[PDB]
């Protein structure tokens, strides 16, 4: 059962958390106090992790604290568990260069599996982690070798479940029958501003039951045994994901328990003392009882070591029995793209005019054949986005080996799950939606930037050329909205050859989300792209068509579909005697990470006659065009019309670029 030492451990977590919040004079103490029993039971009796090996173990049970305001409890848990969070690390909570940030951040603190500040994304990321385990289990598990047999756990709050991303993810998870996803809900019945009664009165468990989820109610948050029994029931439900609703008194033992006051402000030294009185805690501050430390050592370090060693031996036998597949497992988790992966990648010729999206599909198809760890889907847009791998099955409960994922019209959930799949390891994911609906998945793109996750976004329908669907479905500001974001690689391919090479950047990217901005409209193949694209797209901007002279009199900058106008302009300008360089800038960010010498080759400082043609906003174009430069952009919303007409009416004609260049030349 659960002994007195076990309750000491619970209260150690409680005291460490609340002390850490107080020293910082910042932080959230209520959830740590309320959720400390459910956390303790999970880690000590049910979570299989080897703290000694950190996150290196592939089959570690995955735990996400979606309610990141409980960071102090997680740090308390990592310290007790044997991860490298020290007592002094706890004391530096919410301080400069601390290993204990106010909200958990992956790769900043040992043992944190996800960056979980924003609400609902952690659940969705945990959904994706179970998707990955089911997929990798089906892909690699053979009889007598359970190479992937682990559970995804999350601890959420009332806020996580009021967010659409979780609701989207939970319907997804229920559909995908993720029996190994166990979410613990800290139903403290309170939120930041007050009681759940003022805005959140739904039957969460019934909703989850409608999604296909098992719902277990533990009416006593402080009954460890009831929580441990619930986890076992959830593990027994192999066909359905499980929500264990743990009713807790936020700030348990504190004077202001069951109020919003304990949510986000330090309890105060009065609160700590009174809470300790309830616990009978007369221990010194930032002190862990010896009994507790040994309990955590036996329960987590010792058992964890035995489990990984056992798994490691099974993999040893697995490698002998199935050498090629085991190596694949190893290479996928280490992010090693297969040899000659790019060999059969499509190439295109000057006669051709193919949409960037069709070109993407072709790259995707060969990528899927070559890379067995490559998988992905769309938000009900695979036909429109051309994100489907023909010759591969769909990712279904019946065939988890399938690598085509039907996310549904759940873009945010797709994006966050994708972040979780990347975080899990063994897979490279892509996700498809229209470019205008990047808005829906934007917070998860920002999480991917912070988390340095090599997610690929296949976002199509880049411009007003979509046409008849109209302003709501035509991106204008979306290219700028991603470019300001730190940590995101945004590439708009200008032809098929640029598209192939953009995918190659994404495949070879290991620390950044990559957004691919692709076109519905058919894209004519440009002059040098067949030969130079693979080498020069990664440089962000290159001289697609050079001027006749060493120094161009002017320079035309263009991205994507509008680079064709540029080359046609170059010739018309030549007939009137003007010599201009045409630069393809697929990516702003890739270009800025290049040398000053390279930037000079593409955009020489001498030439102030810079005209930029982009079917997008003008924001940030003065960086390259200049104060004195000119730009053909759209700074207004779209229209419902044949796309060819909208472009023509919005100034994307060879004649207009000539006139604007000539006016600037004056």
Residues with catalytic function: 411
Cβ-based neighbours of 54, under 8 Å, separated by 6 or more: 83, 84, 110, 111
Q: How far apart are CA 526 and CA 523, in angstroms?
A: 9
Q: Is 69 annotated as a binding residue?
A: yes
Member of 67, 77, 204, 573 binding a second copy (CB under 8 A)? 204
Stretch 416-455 residues interacting with a second copy (CB under 8 A): 436-437, 439-440, 442-443, 446-447, 449-450
Longest dimension (CA), the chain: 91
Q: Which residues of 37-65 are buried (b: 16+ CB within 10 A; e: fewer)?
A: bbbbbbbbbbbbbbbeeebebbbbbbbbb
Question: How far is the CA of 417 from the CAs of 126, 163, 401, 429, in angstroms?
Answer: 7, 15, 17, 10
Sheet containing 580-584: order of strands: 542-545, 580-584, 554-558, 610-613, 630-632
- Binding flag, residue 394, a second copy (CB under 8 A): yes
Q: How far apart are CA 519 and CA 499, in angstroms?
A: 10
Q: Rounding to the nearest 10 degrees, give the CA dihedral for residues 118, 120, 124, 127.
A: 120
Ranges assigned E (strand) in 547-608: 554-558, 580-584
Cβ-based neighbours of 306, under 8 Å, separated by 6 or more: none
Q: For the window 431-470, what string marks contact with ligand TPP as x by the rule CB under 6 A?
A: ------x--x------------------------------
Cβ proximity of 631 and 554 under 8 Å:
no
- Binding flag, residue 376, a second copy (CB under 8 A): no
Q: How far is CA 79 from the centre of its chain?
A: 27
If one counts every other C-beta atom within 10 angstroms of the C-beta of residue 137, the result is 18
If one counts every other C-beta atom within 10 angstroms of the C-beta of residue 287, the result is 14
Q: How far is the CB of 185 from Mg ion (least distance, A)?
A: 9
Count, residues near ligand TPP per rule CB under 6 A: 25
- Binding flag, residue 510, a second copy (CB under 8 A): no
Cβ-based neighbours of 500, under 8 Å, separated by 6 or more: 345, 346, 347, 359, 362, 363, 533, 534
Count, residues near a second copy per rule CB under 8 A: 110
Q: How far apart are CA 520 and CA 460, in angstroms?
A: 7
335 or 487: whose CB is closer to a second copy? 487
- Binding flag, residue 102, a second copy (CB under 8 A): yes
Stretch 18-77 residues interacting with ligand TPP (CB under 6 A): 28, 30-31, 67, 69
Member of 159, 271, 493, 643 binding ligand TPP (CB under 6 A)? 159
Stretch 382-411 residues interacting with ligand TPP (CB under 6 A): 409
Stretch 86-125 residues interacting with Mg ion (CB under 5 A): none
Query: Which stretch in 183-191, 203-211, 577-585, 596-604 sits in contact with ligand TPP by CB under 6 A?
Result: 183-191
28 or 357: whose CB is closer to ligand TPP? 28
Tokens read off for 292: 């507790």
Q: How far apart are CA 75 and CA 251, in angstroms?
A: 17
Q: How far apart are CA 554 and CA 570, in angstroms?
A: 10
Q: Is 158 annotated as a binding residue?
A: yes
157 or 251: whose CB is closer to Mg ion? 157
Q: How far is the CB of 440 from ligand TPP (least distance, A)?
A: 5
**Helix (H) or strand (E) segment spanning residue 383:** helix 382-385
Contact partner at residue 486 from ligand TPP, Mg ion, a second copy, none, CB < 5 to 8 Å by partner kind: a second copy
Member of 219, 306, 393, 636 binding a second copy (CB under 8 A)? 636
Ranges assigned E (strand) in 511-588: 514-517, 522-524, 542-545, 554-558, 580-584
Contact partner at residue 30 from Mg ion, ligand TPP, a second copy, none, CB < 5 to 8 Å by partner kind: ligand TPP
Stretch 110-139 residues interacting with a second copy (CB under 8 A): 115, 117-120
Query: Which stretch in 90-98, 182-190, 314-322, 646-654 sits in contact with ligand TPP by CB under 6 A?
Result: 182-190
Tokens read off for 233: 């029931």
Residue with tokens 């139903």: 187
Q: How far is the CB of 521 from ligand TPP (least distance, A)?
A: 18
Q: Is 14 annotated as a binding residue?
A: no
Q: Is 46 annotated as a binding residue?
A: no
Which pairs count as long-range contacts for 87-95, CB under 8 Å and 24+ apart, including other chains? 87/286, 87/288, 90/16, 90/19, 90/20, 90/286, 91/20, 91/23, 91/286, 93/20, 93/21, 93/23, 93/24, 93/27, 94/24, 94/26, 94/27, 95/24
Member of 59, 61, 133, 158 binding Mg ion (CB under 5 A)? 158
Stretch 409-428 residues interacting with ligand TPP (CB under 6 A): 409
- Binding flag, residue 426, Mg ion (CB under 5 A): no
Member of 188, 382, 419, 545 binding a second copy (CB under 8 A)? 382
- Binding flag, residue 230, ligand TPP (CB under 6 A): no
Query: Which stretch in 29-37, 136-144, 217-225, 465-473 sits in contact with a second copy by CB under 8 A?
Result: 465-473
Query: Which stretch in 115-123, 166-174, 504-512, 628-636 sits in contact with ligand TPP by CB under 6 A?
Result: 115-123
Member of 30, 104, 157, 377 binding Mg ion (CB under 5 A)? 157
354: β partners: 523
Cβ-based neighbours of 284, under 8 Å, separated by 6 or more: none
Query: Which stretch in 189-197, 227-235, 340-348, 581-589 sits in contact with ligand TPP by CB under 6 A?
Result: 189-197
How is residue 69 annotated by DSSP?
Answer: G
What DSSP line would sit under 611-630, residue for residue? Answer: EEE-SS--TTTHHHH-SS-E
- Binding flag, residue 371, a second copy (CB under 8 A): no
- Measured in degrees and rounded to the nearest 5, phi and psi for residue 191 equal -140, -175
Member of 15, 109, 188, 633 binding Mg ion (CB under 5 A)? 188
- Measured in degrees and rounded to the nearest 5, phi and psi for residue 517 equal -100, 105
Contact partner at residue 527 from Mg ion, a second copy, ligand TPP, none, CB < 5 to 8 Å by partner kind: none
Q: Is 357 annotated as a binding residue?
A: yes
- Binding flag, residue 600, a second copy (CB under 8 A): no
159 or 454: whose CB is closer to ligand TPP? 159
Q: How far apart are CA 84 and CA 15, in angstroms?
A: 19
- Binding flag, residue 56, a second copy (CB under 8 A): no
- Measured in degrees and rounded to the nearest 5, phi and psi for residue 84 equal -90, 65
Stretch 251-280 residues interacting with ligand TPP (CB under 6 A): 263
How is residue 197 annotated by DSSP?
Answer: G
Enumerate the known binding-site residues for Mg(2+). 158, 188, 190
Enumerate the known binding-site residues for thiamine diphosphate. 69, 117-119, 159, 188, 263, 437
Enumerate the known binding-site residues. 28, 69, 117-119, 158-159, 188, 190, 263, 357, 384, 437, 461, 469, 473, 520
- Residues engaged in binding ligand TPP (CB under 6 A): 28, 30-31, 67, 69, 117-119, 157-160, 163, 186, 188, 190-192, 250, 263, 380-381, 409, 437, 440
Enumerate the known binding-site residues for substrate. 28, 263, 357, 384, 461, 469, 473, 520
- Residues engaged in binding Mg ion (CB under 5 A): 157-158, 188
């Amino acid at each position: 059962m659960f002994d007195k030492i076990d309750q000491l451990g619970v209260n150690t977590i409680r005291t460490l958390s609340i002390e850490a919040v107080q020293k910082a004079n910042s932080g959230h103490p209520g959830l740590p106090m309320g959720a400390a029993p459910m956390a303790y039971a999970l880690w000590t009796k049910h979570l299989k992790v080897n703290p000694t090996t950190s996150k290196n173990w592939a089959d570690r049970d995955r735990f996400v604290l979606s309610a990141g305001h409980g960071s102090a409890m997680l740090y308390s848990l990592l310290h007790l568990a044997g991860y490298q969070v020290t007592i002094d690390d706890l004391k530096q909570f919410r301080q400069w260069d601390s290993k204990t940030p106010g909200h958990p951040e992956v790769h900043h603190t040992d043992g944190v599996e996800a960056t979980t500040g924003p609400l609902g994304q952690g659940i969705a990321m945990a959904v994706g982690m179970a998707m990955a385990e089911a997929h990798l289990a089906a892909t690699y598990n053979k009889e007598n070798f359970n190479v992937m047999d682990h559970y995804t756990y999350a601890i959420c709050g009332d806020g996580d479940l009021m967010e659409g991303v979780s609701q989207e993810a939970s319907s997804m998870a229920g559909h995908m029958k993720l029996g190994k996803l166990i979410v613990l809900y800290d139903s403290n019945d309170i939120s930041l501003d007050g009681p759940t009664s003022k805005a959140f009165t739904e039957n969460v468990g019934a909703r989850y039951e409608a999604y296909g989820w098992q719902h277990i109610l533990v009416k006593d948050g402080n009954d460890l045994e009831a929580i441990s029994k619930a986890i076992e029931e959830a593990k027994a439900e192999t066909d359905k994901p499980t929500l264990i609703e743990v009713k807790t008194v936020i700030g348990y033992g504190a004077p202001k328990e069951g109020t919003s006051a304990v949510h986000g402000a330090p309890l105060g030294e009065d609160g700590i003392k009174m809470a300790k009185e309830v616990y009978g805690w007369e221990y010194p501050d930032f002190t862990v009882p010896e009994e507790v430390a040994a309990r955590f050592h036996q329960t987590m370090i010792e058992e964890g070591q035995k489990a990984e060693d056992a798994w490691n031996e099974m993999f040893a036998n697995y490698k002998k029995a199935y050498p090629e597949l085991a190596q694949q497992f190893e290479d996928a988790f280490d992010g090693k793209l297969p040899e000659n992966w790019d060999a059969e990648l499509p190439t295109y010729e000057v006669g051709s005019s193919q949409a960037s999206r069709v070109s993407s599909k072709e790259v995707i198809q060969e990528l899927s054949k070559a890379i067995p760890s490559f998988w992905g889907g769309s938000a009900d847009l695979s036909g429109s986005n051309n994100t489907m791998v023909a010759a591969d099955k769909d990712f279904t409960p019946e065939h988890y080996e399938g690598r085509n994922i039907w996310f549904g019209v759940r873009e945010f959930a797709m994006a966050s799950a994708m972040n979780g799949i990347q975080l899990h390891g063994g897979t490279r994911i892509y996700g498809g939606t229209f470019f205008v609906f990047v808005d829906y998945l934007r917070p998860a793109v920002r999480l991917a930037a912070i988390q340095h996750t090599p997610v690929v976004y296949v976002l199509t329908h880049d411009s007003v050329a979509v046409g008849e669907d109209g302003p709501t479905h035509e991106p204008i500001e979306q290219l700028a909205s991603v470019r300001c974001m730190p940590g995101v690689q945004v590439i708009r391919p200008a032809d098929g050859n640029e598209t192939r090479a953009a995918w190659k950047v994404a495949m070879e990217t290991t620390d950044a989300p990559t957004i691919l901005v692709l076109s519905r409209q058919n894209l004519p193949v440009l002059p040098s792209t067949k030969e130079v694209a693979d080498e020069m797209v990664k440089k962000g901007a290159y001289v697609l068509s050079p001027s006749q002279g060493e120094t161009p009199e002017g320079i035309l900058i263009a991205t994507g579909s509008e680079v064709d106008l540029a080359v046609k302009a170059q010739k018309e300008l030549a007939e009137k005697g003007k010599d201009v360089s045409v630069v393809s800038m697929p990516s702003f960010d890739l270009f800025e990470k290049q040398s000053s010498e390279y930037k000079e080759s593409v955009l020489p400082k001498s030439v102030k006659k810079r005209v930029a043609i982009e079917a997008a906003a003008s924001f940030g174009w003065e960086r390259y065009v200049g104060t004195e430069g000119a730009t053909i952009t759209i700074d207004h919303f779209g229209a419902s019309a044949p796309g060819t007409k909208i472009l023509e009416e919005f100034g994307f004609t060879v004649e207009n670029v000539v006139n604007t260049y000539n006016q600037l030349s004056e």
